[PDB]
């Protein structure tokens, strides 16, 4: 089973914030974190990638961990894929 792992969009959350998350959690170099950021931004959300069930949810839990400890709402969550 492979799983989108989406990143969704909110009016609080630091931009700076999301391009950490992207490269902290995804690997990401600095260049595709901010496109992903943007399209965050102006799309509403963002498939960060797409994984594996099990480190699906690693990756959504960590997500939100890092996120709700640095006091920020960001929604990070799960969808099959299909594809």
Known sequence: SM???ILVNDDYTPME?????LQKFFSYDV???TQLML???????????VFTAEVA????????????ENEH???CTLEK???
């Open 57 to 68: 949810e690693t990756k959504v839990a960590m997500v939100n961990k890092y996120a709700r």
């Open 3 to 5: 799983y989108k792992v």
């Open 31 to 33: 260049e595709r974190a």
């Open 39 to 49: 399209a965050v931004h102006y799309q509403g959300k963002a498939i960060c990638g």
């Open 81 to 83: 894929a299909g594809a």
């Open 17 to 21: 914030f999301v391009i950490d998350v």
């Open 73 to 75: 709402p960001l929604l």
